[PDB]
Amino acid sequence: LNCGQVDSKMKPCLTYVQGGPGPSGECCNGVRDLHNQAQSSGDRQTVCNCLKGIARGIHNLNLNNAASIPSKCNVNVPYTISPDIDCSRIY
Numbered sequence: 171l172n173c174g175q176v177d178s179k180m181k182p183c184l185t186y187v188q189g190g191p192g193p194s195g196e197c198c199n200g201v202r203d204l205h206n207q208a209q210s211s212g213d214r215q216t217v218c219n220c221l222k223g224i225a226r227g228i229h230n231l232n233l234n235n236a237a238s239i240p241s242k243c244n245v246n247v248p249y250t251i252s253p254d255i256d257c258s259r260i261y
Contacts, residue, residue, distance in 0.1 A: 218257035
């Protein structure tokens with residue numbers, strides 16, 4: 171797992187986090203697949219570091235939409251999807 175992979179998996183969610191409709195089925199499939207690949211603490215931290223960086227560069231990022239992705243896509247992400255998220259504390 172690396173950031174390029176995270177970007178590919180999450181890209182289908184881009185329009186949704188930018189205020190568009192969704193999450194699309196493709197967005198959720200990517201989320202579910204990424205979730206499945208983030209098996210170790212290290213992978214989960216990687217996902218966090220990668221998305222933390224991605225988020226800052228997304229124009230019109232809708233955090234409410236971003237935060238609704240786990241529930242809507244049926245994946246457990248027991249962490250607040252916030253900009254100030256501390257990735258070193260994800261395990």
